[PDB]
Design an enzyme around this catalytic site. Sequence first.
Site, mmCIF file in Angstrom:
data_model
loop_
_atom_site.group_PDB
_atom_site.id
_atom_site.type_symbol
_atom_site.label_atom_id
_atom_site.label_comp_id
_atom_site.label_asym_id
_atom_site.label_seq_id
_atom_site.Cartn_x
_atom_site.Cartn_y
_atom_site.Cartn_z
ATOM 1 C CG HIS A 1 -1.731 -1.321 1.302
ATOM 2 N ND1 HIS A 1 -2.749 -1.604 0.423
ATOM 3 C CD2 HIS A 1 -1.666 -2.371 2.153
ATOM 4 C CE1 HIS A 1 -3.286 -2.769 0.734
ATOM 5 N NE2 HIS A 1 -2.626 -3.261 1.768
ATOM 6 C CG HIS B 1 3.147 5.523 5.945
ATOM 7 N ND1 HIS B 1 2.853 5.404 7.294
ATOM 8 C CD2 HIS B 1 2.111 6.176 5.393
ATOM 9 C CE1 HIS B 1 1.648 5.908 7.533
ATOM 10 N NE2 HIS B 1 1.172 6.354 6.404
ATOM 11 C CG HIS C 1 -0.306 8.636 1.944
ATOM 12 N ND1 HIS C 1 -1.072 7.497 1.825
ATOM 13 C CD2 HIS C 1 -0.067 8.782 3.271
ATOM 14 C CE1 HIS C 1 -1.336 7.023 3.033
ATOM 15 N NE2 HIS C 1 -0.635 7.704 3.911
ATOM 16 C CD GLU D 1 -3.456 9.957 2.726
ATOM 17 O OE1 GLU D 1 -3.233 9.957 3.956
ATOM 18 O OE2 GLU D 1 -3.888 8.986 2.066
ATOM 19 C CG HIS E 1 0.905 10.290 7.082
ATOM 20 N ND1 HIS E 1 -0.157 9.665 6.470
ATOM 21 C CD2 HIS E 1 0.776 11.607 6.817
ATOM 22 C CE1 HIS E 1 -0.910 10.585 5.929
ATOM 23 N NE2 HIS E 1 -0.397 11.765 6.166
ATOM 24 C CB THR F 1 -5.393 8.378 5.674
ATOM 25 O OG1 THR F 1 -4.094 7.922 5.407
ATOM 26 C CG2 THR F 1 -5.379 9.649 6.522
ATOM 27 C CB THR F 2 -4.719 2.820 5.121
ATOM 28 O OG1 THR F 2 -4.007 2.756 6.354
ATOM 29 C CG2 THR F 2 -3.860 3.611 4.096
HETATM 30 ZN ZN LIG Z 1 -0.472 7.650 6.114
#
Ligand SMILES: [Zn+2]
Length: 257
Positions: free
Chosen positions: A61, A91, A93, A103, A116, A195-196
């Site tokens: 992901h 991690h 995005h 995000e 994040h 957010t996942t």
């Molecule tokens: Zn995140």
Amino acid sequence: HWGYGKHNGPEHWHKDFPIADGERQSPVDIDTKAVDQDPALKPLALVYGEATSDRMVNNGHSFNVEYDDSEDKAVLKDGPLTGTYRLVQFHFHWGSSDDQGSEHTVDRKKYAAELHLVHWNTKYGDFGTAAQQPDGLAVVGVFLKVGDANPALQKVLDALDSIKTEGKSTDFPNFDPGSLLPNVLDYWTYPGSLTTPPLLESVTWIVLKEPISVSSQQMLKFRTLNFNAEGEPELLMLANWRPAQPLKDRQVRGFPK
Ligand SMILES: [Zn+2]
């Protein structure tokens, strides 16, 4: 299995994870003129001098840089928080072009990517227990603004060829997570979610106002990763951002204002 494709992406997550439509979902757009000051807020304390990175892992992901969180080696205190929150991993995005990928957004501006840094409250003993509680997690979001190439970021990106496919990991010692922070730690904060999926409503969000830099060439490297495992058809990680969700009955607060 959830993802970011046309059938299994953010628009559809509500089917298997109905908390997607919850009261405190993330990310959000930060309408800066609707931000409140609060004198109870403190400067953020990112105590990362003793951080011990462990490894980098492609989880299907995104990719995570994992830290040793067995004791208080890299912790987050103050800002909007009460207590100690230990850094477990960070991690990113990103999107499939430079004009999108963050995000959180700021007055509707999208940045190329977002970092994040995920922390958990020592009151709960470990990450999984903490992820079930409204005060359990604290995530520091840092925007990546396309511009100059970032040397600290390049140390992460240099390792990506070793974790192309889901399940792969590489040793990754001695990475200083403080090297991915802006010089000024001004922030916005609001109560939100992961957010996942499973989108748990356990996160105190701390979104830093000042981005760090990334170059356009550097952004290419993110998008070399694969969502799939080795031997399966190549599903490039071209974009892995959830879009802004409605703020609903929450207030974003800002420090120092
Ligand atoms: Zn995140």
